[PDB]
A = this chain, B = another copy of it.
């Protein structure tokens, strides 16, 4: 993954290869 923003970025998040587990029991 290549990222190169000129100018004025804002909250740049180049997440990559991010396994996610989300389980909720009520």
Distance to closest chain B CB from A7 (angstroms): 4
Interface of chain A, helix or strand or loop or mixed?
loop
Q: B20 near A20 (CB under 8 angstroms)? A: yes
Categorize the interface residue count of chain A.
20 to 34
Q: Which residues from B are CB-within-8-Å of A25?
A: 24-26
Q: Assuming the A-B contacts A1-B1, A8-B7, A26-B6, are A16 and B19 also in contact, with contact meaning beta carbons closer than 8 angstroms in the complex?
A: no
Chain A, 4-26, contact with B by CB distance < 8 Å: what is the 0/1 string?
A: 11111111111111111111111
Q: Which residues from B are CB-within-8-Å of A11?
A: 10-13
Partner of A8, one of B9, B15, B16, B18: B9
Q: Taking beta carbons and an 8 Å cutoff, which residues of A are in contact with B? A: 1-26
